[PDB]
DNA sequence: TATACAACCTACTACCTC
RNA sequence: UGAGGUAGUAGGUUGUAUA
C-alpha cells in the first residue's frame, strides 16, 4: 500500500480582508474588493437582439434560484452581490439591419463571409468609440443565430488593435426557451442552472469593466509565475511556432498582479516546441523589468511552467540573464497519464487535493474529483489527475503543489469552484489563440480585459 | 437590543439567511431560527429590539410566524413604540391587498425590487430610530457561516483504500538473448508477423527472442549457439550498469518494453476474446455467445442499447520505471446484431458518451476487475507465452493506495 | 530520403452537464 | 462564442537500429 499526502485548499482574499474557498459564496456575503461605480453598456446587434438584452439584463436585478441551491448557489442579484449598477436603461445602441446581414451572408465565401461580418461589427464598434460623446465600457456583441454557423478570434484582434473591451453573446444564451426547434424541447436548457448563468456572466460583465473581483493570499512573496504555451502559427505561410507567456506576481504589499507577457517568439522549426537562446533571453529580460518596474526590486526566485519539457540550450540563456540570487525553477505539467484511482467502497470518486508523490522531482495532483463543500463531483466518470515534474531547478515538490492549487484557484473568467489545471496555461492558450488569427500586431496589451 | 426575524420554515430561507449575514456583519446582534419553542417567546418579549416579519404567499398564513406575531404585537402594545414591527416585503405574486390583519395597516419595505435598495433603506430606519449596534465585525458573519451552513461539509480524518488500474508484474523472463542468425534470416522477411516476440534492434546481433525455436518459419536450423549473446534480465533494469559500447541502459528498457506490448497483443490471440482498431492502439472484447447470461461473475459484460449492444473492452501498454506495470484502459465497443461490428466511427462516439453517464466508479471498477480476471488463467496470474519454456506473468491484483483525510459519501 | 518501434507534442470534432 | 469536463479521430517530432 501506498500513501497519498493531502495538501490543503488555498484561500481566497475578498473585500474587508476576509478568506474563504469559494467565489459564488464569499463575494455574496463580502464581495468584491474595488469601487466601480457602474457599469456603461453597449450594444451590437439586430433590434430583436436589443429586446432579448434588455430582457434578461431587467431579470437578472432580482434573485434567481437553482434547482440545487449546495451544489450550485443561488444569485442575489447583481445590485446586491456586487454594490454596483448595471442597467438596462443607459444603453448605447448601434444597430445592424437585417438587410445588411442578409447581403453579407447570402452566398460570397466562408474567408469572405467571416471577414466582411468582423468588419461590419468593428466598423460600427470602432466608429461609435472614436466619434461620440457618451462613454461605452463593455460592448456587447449580441450575434444571431445565423451569425455563428473563426468570428469571434478575428473580432477580438481587430478590436484588440484599438483596445476596446468586447463581450460576446449569442441570442441562444439569453433567449434558451424561445429558441425551441427539435420537437418542442429547447436544445440547451438552462432551467436547473439559471443562478450559475447569471453568476458567470455578472462576473464575466464586472471584471471586463475594470472590476476586481477578488485575490489570492495565500503564495509565496517575491516568487514569479510564468507559463508558457506554443501554438501552431504553421497554417499560414513559412510554418513556425509562437510562444506566449503570462505572469502572476505580487505587489510590493497586499495585492495580486496577474497579466500577461507577449509578443510571441517564433520558431523556425516544425515539431521544435522549444525556444532559441536570443528569444529565451528577452522573454526572460521583459519578465525581469515587468516585475521590477512594479515591485522597485528584483525576484527572489522565477517559477517557469509549461506543458513541455525545456533543454539544456534555453536554460543556460535564462541563467545568462538572472542577476544577482534570483534562482530558476522548470515545472512540466502534462495532463493525460493514464492513471486512474477507484474508490474500493462507494459509487463516488476519489477527494480532490490527493497528491501521489512518486519521486522527489515527480508527483500526481489531483484537481478533479469530489468537493466536500459542494458534495457532488468537478467532473464525470473518474477523474484523471495531472502529473507535475521539476524539469530544471532545485524545489520542494510539495511546495510546488501547493503554489499548483493557488494557480489553479485564479480563474475570472467563469465564476467556478476550481479548474484541472494552472490558469496561467489556459490564458496564455487564449492569448496566444486570438494572436494567431490577427495580422502582425506590434506591441500587444497586456490586459486580459481585450484578451478574455 | 436584538432583531427578530419570522420566516416561513422551508421556503423564504434563502432570503433570510442572506439578510442575517448581512445585518451580523454591520454589528446588528440578530435572533432567528436558522442560526440557533418557550425561548421564542422569552425572546420577543424581554430581549428583542424590533421585530421584522417577512411576507410572501408561502407565509402569510403559516401558525408559528402568526404566533409571535400575535406576541410581537402584545408587547408593542406596552412598550409604547409604533415601529416594533416592520414587514418586509419579498414576494411579486402577493398583493398589497391580500396582507392579512395585524399588519396589513404597516407600510412595508418592498424587497422586491432589490434587495441592495431595500437593505440600505433598512438600514436607514436603524439609524433613524436609534437601533443599538456595535462597530462592524465582519468576521463574525464568516464564522457563523462556517459553524452553522458548513459543519457537516468539511474534510474529515478518515482512512480509505484506493485501487488502480496499474497490475504488476510479478517475474520476468531471466536471461535476454542476442542472437546473430545471419544469412539464416532473409533481410526482407518482415519480423513481426513471427510467432514469438522479436525485434531486429542493434547492429546485427538481431531477433530479440527470450526463446529459441522459430522453426517451420525460418527453416535454417543451422546456428552455432556460441556467438549468441544474453544478457541479464535484473541487471537491464534497476540501473545495474548493463550499459555497455554494444547497447546502453537507457535503449535496454525501451527495447523490454516492446517485447512486453507485442507479448500482450499476441496472446490475446489465442483467448475468447476479439479486437478493435483505434487511433494509436488496439481494444479487445468479448463477444455476445460466450459467457453465461453476459455475467461473468455476477458483473455484466456486455448488454443492450435500444437496438444495439454494447461490450466493455480494454487496452493495455508497458511501463517501467516505478515497477514494471501493465497500464489498463477501459473502453466500451458498440456492435448490431452481438457478434458484428459496427463500421460507422461516427455512431460511435455518440454512443459512448451516451451509455458512460450513467457509469460511475462502482461500475468501472468491477466492469474492469471482471475483465482482467476473466482473461487469467491460472487463479493469481495470467500467462503471457513469450516462448516455449518462459513467461511474463502478471498479477490479477492491480495496485492499491491509502490515505489518512477522506469525506463522509452522500446518503 | 524511406519501413518498423517507444516516448513525447498538438489540433480538431462531438456529446454530456452531475 | 456564459462555462466546465469527458472521449474519439487525425497527424507530427526525437531517439536508436535498418534502407
Ligand atoms: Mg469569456
Known sequence: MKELIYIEEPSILFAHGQKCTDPRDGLALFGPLNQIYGIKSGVVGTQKGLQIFKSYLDKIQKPIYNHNNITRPMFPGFEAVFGCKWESQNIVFKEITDEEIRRYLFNASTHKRTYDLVTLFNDKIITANKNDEERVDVWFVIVPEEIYKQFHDQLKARLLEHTIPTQILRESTLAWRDFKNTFGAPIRDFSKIEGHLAWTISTAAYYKAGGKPWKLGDIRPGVCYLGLVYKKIEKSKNPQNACCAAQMFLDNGDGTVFKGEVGPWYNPEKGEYHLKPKEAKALLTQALESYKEQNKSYPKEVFIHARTRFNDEEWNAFNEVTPKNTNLVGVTITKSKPLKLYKTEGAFPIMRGNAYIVDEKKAFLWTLGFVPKLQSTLSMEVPNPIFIEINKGEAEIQQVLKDI???????????????????????????????????????????????? | ??????????????????????????????????????????????????????????????????????????????????????????????????????????????????????????????????????????????????????????????????????????????????????????????????????????????????????????????????????????????????????????????????????????????????????????????????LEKDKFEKIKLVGKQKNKYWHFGISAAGKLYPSPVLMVSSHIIFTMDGINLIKSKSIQHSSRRKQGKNWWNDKWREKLLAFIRFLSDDQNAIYLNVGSEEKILISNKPLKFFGKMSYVTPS
Open chain 1, 405 to 452: 492549487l493557488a494557480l489553479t484557484k485564479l480563474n475570472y473568467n467563469a465564476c467556478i469552484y476550481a479548474d484541472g489545471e494552472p490558469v496561467t496555461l489556459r490564458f496564455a492558450n487564449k492569448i496566444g489563440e486570438i494572436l494567431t488569427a490577427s495580422t502582425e500586431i506590434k506591441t500587444p496589451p497586456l490586459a486580459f480585459k481585450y484578451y478574455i
Open chain 2, 1 to 290: 437590543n436584538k432583531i427578530f426575524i419570522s420566516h416561513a420554515t422551508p421556503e423564504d430561507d434563502d432570503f433570510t439567511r442572506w439578510l442575517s449575514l448581512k445585518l451580523i456583519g454591520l454589528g446588528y446582534e440578530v435572533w432567528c431560527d436558522i442560526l440557533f419553542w418557550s425561548t421564542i417567546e422569552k425572546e420577543i418579549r424581554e430581549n428583542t429590539c424590533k421585530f421584522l416579519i417577512v411576507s410572501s404567499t408561502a407565509g402569510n398564513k403559516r401558525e408559528g410566524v402568526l404566533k409571535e406575531l400575535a406576541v410581537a404585537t402584545k408587547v408593542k402594545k406596552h412598550l409604547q413604540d409604533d415601529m416594533f414591527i416592520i414587514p418586509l416585503a419579498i414576494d411579486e405574486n402577493l398583493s398589497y391587498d391580500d396582507i392579512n390583519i395585524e399588519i396589513v395597516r404597516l407600510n412595508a419595505i418592498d424587497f422586491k425590487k432589490s434587495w441592495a435598495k431595500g437593505l440600505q433603506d433598512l438600514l436607514d430606519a436603524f439609524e433613524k430610530q436609534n437601533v443599538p449596534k456595535k462597530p462592524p465585525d465582519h468576521s463574525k458573519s464568516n464564522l457563523l457561516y462556517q459553524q452553522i451552513f458548513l459543519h457537516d461539509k468539511q474534510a474529515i480524518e478518515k482512512e480509505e483504500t484506493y485501487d488502480s488500474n496499474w497490475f504488476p508484474i510479478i517475474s520476468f523472463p531471466n536471461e535476454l538473448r542476442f542472437h546473430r542468425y545471419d544469412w539464416r534470416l532473409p533481410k526482407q522477411f518482415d519480423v513481426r508477423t513471427l510467432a514469438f516476440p522479436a525485434i531486429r534492434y542493434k547492429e546485427y546481433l538481431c531477433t530479440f527472442a527470450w526463446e529459441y525455436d522459430f522453426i517451420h518459419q525460418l527453416p535454417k536450423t543451422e546456428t552455432y549457439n556460441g556467438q549468441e549473446s544474453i544478457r541479464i534480465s535484473t541487471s537491464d533494469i534497476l540501473s545495474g550498469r548493463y550499459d555497455t559500447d554494444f547497447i546502453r541502459n537507457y535503449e535496454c528498457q525501451r527495447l523490454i518494453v516492446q517485447l512486453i506490448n507485442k507479448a500482450f497483443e499476441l496472446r490475446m490471440k489465442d483467448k475468447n476474446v476479439r479486437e478493435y482498431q483505434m487511433s494509436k492502439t488496439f481494444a479487445y472484447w468479448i463477444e455476445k455467445g460466450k
